[PDB]
Amino acid sequence: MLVAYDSMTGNVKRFIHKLNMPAVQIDEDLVIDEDFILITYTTGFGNVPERVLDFLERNNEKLKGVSASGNRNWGDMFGASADKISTKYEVPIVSKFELSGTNNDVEYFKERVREIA
Numbered sequence: 001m002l003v004a005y006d007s008m009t010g011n012v013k014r015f016i017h018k019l020n021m022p023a024v025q026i027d028e029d030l031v032i033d034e035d036f037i038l039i040t041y042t043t044g045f046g047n048v049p050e051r052v053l054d055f056l057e058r059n060n061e062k063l064k065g066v067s068a069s070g071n072r073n074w075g076d077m078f079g080a081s082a083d084k085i086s087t088k089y090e091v092p093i094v095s096k097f098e099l100s101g102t103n104n105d106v107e108y109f110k111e112r113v114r115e116i117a
């Protein structure tokens, strides 16, 4: 399965290189042709980065799940970008992880995508 992602300070980018899966960085022209999983980071107060919101307005029909990178020091706003995406588009939250993730976060993501695919 194809993974689409965005990263501002490189933590999500580090995570997706640990997956060894087909992966594409989001941009303004990208149209995705097949089922995909989104990995986003989380902006202040539980939000979705604008570039990701823009991409999803165009690409949500093929979206099959979302994961968020965040930080537990945000409390119940931890990874809430995934909550908002999941609620809006009616897709599962694959996983939440902190920062660039642990090895267990990597393996869990892959097991959950295998289940959804």
Ligand SMILES: Cc1cc2nc3c(=O)[nH]c(=O)nc-3n(C[C@H](O)[C@H](O)[C@H](O)COP(=O)(O)O)c2cc1C
Pocket: 006, 007, 008, 009, 010, 011, 012, 013, 041, 042, 043, 044, 045, 046, 047, 069, 070, 071, 072, 074, 077, 078, 079, 080, 098, 099, 100
């Ligand atoms: C200004 C700022 C606000 C953030 N707000 C949240 C938040 O509301 N919830 C959360 O879980 N993480 C939050 N984070 C943490 C980031 O989502 C986290 O560092 C993430 O790994 C960044 O991914 P990136 O390095 O790929 O850009 C915030 C980080 C910054 C610098």
Ligand SMILES: C[As](C)(=O)[O-]
Pocket: 023, 024, 025
């Ligand atoms: C070409 As890539 C996997 O660093 O987005």
Ligand SMILES: [Zn+2]
Pocket: 017
């Ligand atoms: Zn690379």
Ligand SMILES: [Zn+2]
Pocket: 050, 053, 054
């Ligand atoms: Zn916009």
Ligand SMILES: [Zn+2]
Pocket: 053, 054, 057
């Ligand atoms: Zn917009």
Ligand SMILES: [Zn+2]
Pocket: 075, 076, 077
């Ligand atoms: Zn709260």
